[PDB]
């Protein structure tokens, strides 16, 4: 996930990401978008809900 997205998420309320077959590594990049109220992770191939 781009770091700039993580930075701007400080005011984001809804985020949707589509990887269409690409495995997505969060590597703990979600604890700065604290304003988010809706999280959509479609075709991101996690195989595990991130912490």
């Amino acid at each position, epitope marked *: 996930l781009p770091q700039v997205v993580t930075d701007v998420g400080v005011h984001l309320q809804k985020l949707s990401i*589509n990887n*269409e*077959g690409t495995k997505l590594i969060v590597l703990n990049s979600l604890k700065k978008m604290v304003n988010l109220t809706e999280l959509e992770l479609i075709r991101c191939d996690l195989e595990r809900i991130p912490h």
Partner: nanobody
Amino acid sequence: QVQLVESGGGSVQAGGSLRLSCAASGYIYQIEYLGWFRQAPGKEREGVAALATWNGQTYYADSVKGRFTVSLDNAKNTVYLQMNSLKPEDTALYYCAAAYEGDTSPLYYEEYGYWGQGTQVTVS
């Protein structure tokens, strides 16, 4: 709205070959997801294949994987299906399937919004 026309099936032998096809008319740009759906006689329809419109990622059902090959002709707005060494399990009713944007249904007829006439494929 969007209409689909397909052909290229019929009666073949196990060990024959077929070249399925389907052409699209109407709104050709708005269609995001394309695939094939086959229907056994009296049984539920099965999503045969799936393809991203411009992302270009191809998908197929396990029962037809390695035997059925999707083909798309952007020039003529056509979707083909080329298969060989068929099996009697391929005898089914195949419908041209198109889905607009927002949906990520590879082989599920749940959200596809346009279907073709239906071509009977017979493999003995």
